[PDB]
Design a protein around this ligand. Structure first.
Ligand code: 7QV
Ligand code: NA
Ligand code: ZN
Length: 258
């Protein structure tokens, strides 16, 4: 598979290798804040990242992933819409060529400069590869980024990026604390959806925080210096690695806040 984000291999093409692209629970979606309803049944959200163990950062040709040790229940997400325990495995971002675009989810059609995805898998399925075959296998915590003040907790990420410029490069990335990427409020929207890249599997409970984090123009500029290509290959900047909003179909987006 040679999927990507360009004219020739971008999201409009994905359905030919991955027919579930046109499925019933695809992501991302536009969150219409006037149609989403507060749900009193939602339990409180629990982000337990105190014991998180980051290992490595990888340019996979699509984004850069900060990977965690998920061989035990270190860093977990529970509560909210979730039943049981979801283990953090990695986070990554999606971003734009310009500050006016980059997020996958939109809020009343508003696009943010970037979107952070903290990816967790349901431990009742034993491993990640089994979890992605299940409708409740993953929980993705999505956090919007807007450009304003710098986010100090992001700068360690920004600073390692020149060591992983091209596809297939990785670097040791230990002792990174993902709590420094969260906004103050855990108010969220939630809906059932999918992975936003191939294989597009319909295995995600999406939890999208309402409060964006602010990052600096300089910080997001450094994201845009990465490359989609491998070393020695013609330079294609890693920008606009986002899928546009997909049809909501027969889904309701629920708000955790009144
Ligand atoms: C193999 O693991 C994967 C594969 C794809 C995705 C995509 O879905 C998404 O929301 N962003 C993505 O890059 C993922 O993240 C949950 C994890
Ligand atoms: Na709207
Ligand atoms: Zn993502």
């Amino acid at each position: 598979h040679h999927w990507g984000y360009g004219k020739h291999n971008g999201p409009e093409h994905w359905h030919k290798d991955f027919p579930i692209a046109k499925g019933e629970r695809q992501s991302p979606v536009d969150i219409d804040t006037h149609t989403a309803k507060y749900d009193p049944s939602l339990k409180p959200l629990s982000v337990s990242y105190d014991q998180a163990t980051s290992l490595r950062i990888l340019n996979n040709g699509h984004a850069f992933n900060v990977e965690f040790d998920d061989s035990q229940d270190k860093a977990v997400l529970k509560g909210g819409p979730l039943d049981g325990t979801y283990r953090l495995i990695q986070f990554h971002f999606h971003w734009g060529s310009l500050d006016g675009q980059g997020s996958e989810h939109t809020v009343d059609k508003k696009k943010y400069a970037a979107e952070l995805h903290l990816v967790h898998w349901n431990t009742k399925y034993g491993d990640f590869g089994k979890a992605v075959q299940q409708p409740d296998g993953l929980a993705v915590l999505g956090i919007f980024l807007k450009v304003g003040s710098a986010k100090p907790g992001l700068q360690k990420v920004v600073d390692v990026l020149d060591s992983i410029k091209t596809k297939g490069k990785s670097a040791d990335f230990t002792n990174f604390d993902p709590r420094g990427l969260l906004p103050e409020s855990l108010d969220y929207w939630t809906y059932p959806g999918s992975l936003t890249t191939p294989p597009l599997l319909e295995c995600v409970t999406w939890i999208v925080l309402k409060e964006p984090i602010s990052v600096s123009s300089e910080q997001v500029l450094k994201f845009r210096k990465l490359n989609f290509n491998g070393e020695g290959e013609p330079e294609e900047l890693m920008v606009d690695n986002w899928r546009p909003a997909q049809p909501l179909k027969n889904r309701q987006i629920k708000a955790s806040f009144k």
